[PDB]
Amino acid sequence: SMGEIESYCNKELGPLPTKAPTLSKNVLDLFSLKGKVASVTGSSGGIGWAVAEAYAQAGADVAIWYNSHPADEKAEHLQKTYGVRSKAYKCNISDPKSVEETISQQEKDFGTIDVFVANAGVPWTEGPEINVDNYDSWNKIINLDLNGVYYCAHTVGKIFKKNGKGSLVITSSMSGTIVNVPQLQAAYNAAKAACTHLTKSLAVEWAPFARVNCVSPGYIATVEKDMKAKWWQLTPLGREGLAQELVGAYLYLASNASTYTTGANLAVDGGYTCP
Amino acid sequence: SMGEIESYCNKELGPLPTKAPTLSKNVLDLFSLKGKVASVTGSSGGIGWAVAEAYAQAGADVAIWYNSHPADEKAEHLQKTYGVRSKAYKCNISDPKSVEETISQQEKDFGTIDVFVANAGVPWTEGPEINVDNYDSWNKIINLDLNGVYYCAHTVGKIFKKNGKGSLVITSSMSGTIVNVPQLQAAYNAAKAACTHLTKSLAVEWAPFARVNCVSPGYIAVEKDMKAKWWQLTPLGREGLAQELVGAYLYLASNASTYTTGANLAVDGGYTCP
Amino acid sequence: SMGEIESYCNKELGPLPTKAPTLSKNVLDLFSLKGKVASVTGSSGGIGWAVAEAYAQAGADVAIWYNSHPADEKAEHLQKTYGVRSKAYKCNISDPKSVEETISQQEKDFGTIDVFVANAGVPWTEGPEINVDNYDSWNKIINLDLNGVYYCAHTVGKIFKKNGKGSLVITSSMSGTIVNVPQLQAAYNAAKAACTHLTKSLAVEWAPFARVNCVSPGYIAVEKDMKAKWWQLTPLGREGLAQELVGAYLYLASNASTYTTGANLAVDGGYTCP
Amino acid sequence: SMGEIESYCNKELGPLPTKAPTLSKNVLDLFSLKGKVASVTGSSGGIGWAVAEAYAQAGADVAIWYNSHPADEKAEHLQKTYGVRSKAYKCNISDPKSVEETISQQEKDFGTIDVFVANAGVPWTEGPEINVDNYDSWNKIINLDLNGVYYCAHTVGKIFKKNGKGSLVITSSMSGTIVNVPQLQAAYNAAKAACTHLTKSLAVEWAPFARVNCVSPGYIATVEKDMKAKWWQLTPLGREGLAQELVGAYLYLASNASTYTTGANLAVDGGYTCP
Ligand SMILES: NC(=O)C1=CN([C@@H]2O[C@H](COP(=O)(O)OP(=O)(O)OC[C@H]3O[C@@H](n4cnc5c(N)ncnc54)[C@H](OP(=O)(O)O)[C@@H]3O)[C@@H](O)[C@H]2O)C=CC1
Ligand SMILES: NC(=O)C1=CN([C@@H]2O[C@H](COP(=O)(O)OP(=O)(O)OC[C@H]3O[C@@H](n4cnc5c(N)ncnc54)[C@H](OP(=O)(O)O)[C@@H]3O)[C@@H](O)[C@H]2O)C=CC1
Ligand SMILES: NC(=O)C1=CN([C@@H]2O[C@H](COP(=O)(O)OP(=O)(O)OC[C@H]3O[C@@H](n4cnc5c(N)ncnc54)[C@H](OP(=O)(O)O)[C@@H]3O)[C@@H](O)[C@H]2O)C=CC1
Ligand SMILES: NC(=O)C1=CN([C@@H]2O[C@H](COP(=O)(O)OP(=O)(O)OC[C@H]3O[C@@H](n4cnc5c(N)ncnc54)[C@H](OP(=O)(O)O)[C@@H]3O)[C@@H](O)[C@H]2O)C=CC1
């Protein structure tokens, strides 16, 4: 190692400095996903479907994931409307083994995976933890909202490493930064904070071959009146967000617009984390 | 409902504002634990034993936890030296059922639990996760360093609510705030970040009856050249000692911190600042 | 008052909930700045010129600011190459009165201001503050890197409120989140942290009519061995380029981020994670 | 430098590792300030007076600071009640020169300064900044709540460096971490965030000879009804704090209880930063 500056972070970067990529000089071209393959978990639901069609509008082939609501006709919609390749995949993400089979199948079907969005999740709906006596709801949150994200990350990182390139986007939540009120959600808040800092941890470990980032959305239209009303009162923009207001953040992170961005948390929460 | 200011955080608080506690006018007496019962998990280990003995020095009865290394001699030493009640308990904290049995037996042996430190944990020692085929290592750390902490918290919070008083201290890590280098520890970093935010979430939920805070230690005193890089990145230029943590745990456990809840206390030699 | 949900953050918002904006259904059109006027301070410099040209490429009219290095040729180049309106303005932003004169003249020359980037700044280059007898260096950085940013913000916020629309982007620094080493930069770090929190404070105050976000760049490409340590501590292993920032500034300036306010966007190669 | 591990943070630490101090083995003795000299700015007001008498109860000599409310009889109270040496000092902290004269006078009067609390400050009381047209209130906040803290820090650090030991405690605010509502306070929020991160910056620079930390209190009893009521609703403990609830944090940081703690922000806010 004499005559080499080795990294304190990850010596697999090789002799420092690493060199910068080549980038289109037109900013609008940086956001293109033409020729890239995207994989979006939870793209049966509101947020995931939104980023999936946003990625298709950017020119990416898109693998769609579902569990209990088959979304083949969504994949058909992307092919019919944007001319891109798409397909739907069924997978219980709580199961590490199904996740690995699905991602391997996608690699074969599309040839590679350039972008991965780990987005599928479930909420905690049971009020304060102290009145919830068995640990099954806690475990169900940890299993999918944290362990499931890691199974997807661990599996696709080996694809990114083999090819030397990739962008992983994790859907976290403002619940990883703050505590939601009045609906108390300790298990979900803890899983999401794990997700945000797993993002930073994987950004360091994957540095030689991929970028890892995360979006922390606020309340997204996607509920008792008096509760929503307190949400609106505590959010500086004064309203809930729309799923279409998130896709710009996911496309920014997925594309060459963010080649120096890794380990970042993009809060898209109407300012809720500020007060 | 009408004629009452209701909390937006937690309606169990009752009509606002809540009542300030009665505190001694001498700052030194605020740190006393006389008449209080403390339970410290992982107190057969370095940090947990230092905290357990410090609580005994502050006057607390101390319940000692161990798993593989029996700590009954540690319990006798607190009894012999400080004249407090102490007993050691064997428990695998990754087992929920076993956690609930131990805490309940402790309530009966001491009468109550006033201070709880969720401290037992294991590190990640396999390097970059991308080369660990099997998920047992990931799951071993989540179950003990996250699920295990929740098992103790859920269980002792019931005691705190029954008595209307209590202080939970969670041992997190600077690994919950930063990413350690060059030893890559993704699973551990993630579990400790969940611990830190679990601290804040439970502070809100438990606020009518208990405080919840956490301590995030840095490196507390295995290849030379790796430490060398730790020292180079630590503003104070050295690793910490177990005795440099006990003031933090005593502050959070005692009446010195009655307005402090949901806080993360960094004791890391400044490592999180660069 | 009765029959209206009033905000706890800012009653200027009116009865809640507020109305979502109308957005294009194609994600790519959300990033367009066609029909919008952008003002970028410090746009004779590296980062600011890259952002100014990117906004022109997105279709915006661009007002260019300079102090000591005239940038009229930069304004002609945006006009010549992208067919947008552009003019360069001379201003010492540490002078409040001079800031207000420039922004007002810009409103008249372009009709309005839709996007503002507060970007001009100077670094600290004297090493450890303990050896700097005189306070002019501390004051020089506070006045330009903090007070100057506020002078522009206070002034352009009036335009945004009059028009009911606008996006302010503040150039902060990873120095607002961490402490740079080994070059010790206390005054600069403090001013950038104030900038980052000024971003959040103004997002709340301006929420009825404008968004306020900030970008925190890392090292963007002076002794070899110091960079060497920068590279060793940066997860990506290299310094950034100015072109790797423009996507962040375009995202925050455009309709792509209509639910994003008070956010700090780190573009630092991961430096804030270790 | 061959044969020496030099710090990446501050090479004035000398060859690494630095060694740990010697510490009493009884935790209660770590909190003692016997034989130490403390200097507390803003100790005419609520918070500063509280930590001053707490420091005196710990056995420290205490220099008391005032500007418009002479507090000599407070210094007399500390001497008469605790047998400690105390004195009052008049100083406009916005003026860098008066600050340096006062601290030099205290060094001569007491012999040294072991602990410094930079606590004096003023609030912003003028609502949203956009309706405040001259910059004088902004400047008055920056001048005292940020520049004044630095003048005190810069001056006492040279005392700490000369003697190789010291503890600086800065009174920040939860306003350095969050945005206060409904009373809008941009200038104060910005000054306080500067204070919190100046703490971290000085912790790195002063590492070879002092520790630097900061306390961020919430709302402390020390105001229109409807406004306070919204504060109470947003604070998890459900009430404002008392000044006596802060002194434990200041004594922890000032004493040998925290010899491995530097660059830390201790939030004492009833949990307000969590929701
Ligand atoms: N404050 C908050 O609560 C915040 C929430 N989020 C998070 O954003 C993510 C997406 O949320 P959103 O689209 O709005 O919610 P939706 O319920 O609308 O969609 C959830 C998706 O997860 C999928 N999924 C559910 N369970 C499983 C399972 N075992 N295995 C595999 N996939 C599963 C569902 O698929 P299917 O329907 O086919 O079963 C669905 O596509 C979530 O992770 C959410 O937690 C982010 C912002 C803030
Ligand atoms: N030392 C350091 O540098 C750092 C430590 N920490 C954390 O502080 C805590 C203790 O650390 P430390 O004292 O240094 O390490 P030690 O190994 O010395 O102590 C570990 C303790 O955890 C107990 N324990 C381990 N596994 C289990 C299990 N299944 N069930 C119940 N108890 C178990 C051990 O009990 P037994 O030995 O009897 O089996 C032991 O008492 C941990 O949370 C650690 O992650 C955080 C930051 C830095
Ligand atoms: N490059 C980096 O690594 C980092 C930069 N930043 C910040 O990004 C901003 C610009 O940085 P960068 O482009 O790299 O440096 P440059 O020196 O290249 O650009 C500085 C710009 O600020 C302008 N300016 C300087 N002083 C004044 C003044 N009194 N009044 C008005 N304008 C003034 C300069 O104008 P002129 O030349 O005409 O006098 C110039 O356009 C700054 O806020 C910087 O602190 C943040 C993190 C890292
Ligand atoms: N959310 C919030 O707003 C928070 C506020 N804080 C901060 O805690 C600190 C102390 O607050 P607190 O005691 O409660 O307020 P007080 O008004 O009661 O006391 C303020 C003290 O500052 C001194 N002082 C005022 N102006 C000057 C000046 N030019 N020069 C020198 N000294 C001056 C005053 O001295 P004299 O009376 O003799 O003129 C007084 O002793 C403050 O910095 C406050 O900003 C911390 C927690 C949260």
Automatic annotation (TrEMBL), chains A, D:
Task: Please name the InterPro entries in this protein's record.
Answer: NAD(P)-bd_dom_sf (IPR036291), SDR_fam (IPR002347)
Q: Which domain of life is it from?
A: Eukaryota
GO MF annotation list: mannitol 2-dehydrogenase (NADP+) activity; oxidoreductase activity, acting on NAD(P)H, oxygen as acceptor
What does the record list as coiled-coil region(s)? Answer: none
CDD domains the record matches: MDH-like_SDR_c
- Tell me the GO BP annotations in alphabetical order: carbohydrate metabolic process; small molecule metabolic process
Write the record's keywords in alphabetical order, separated by commas: NADP, Oxidoreductase
* SUPFAM superfamilies hit by this protein: NAD(P)-binding Rossmann-fold domains
Its family remark reads:
Belongs to the short-chain dehydrogenases/reductases (SDR) family.
Q: What is this protein called?
A: (S)-specific carbonyl reductase
What organism does this protein naturally occur in?
Candida parapsilosis
Gene of origin? scr2
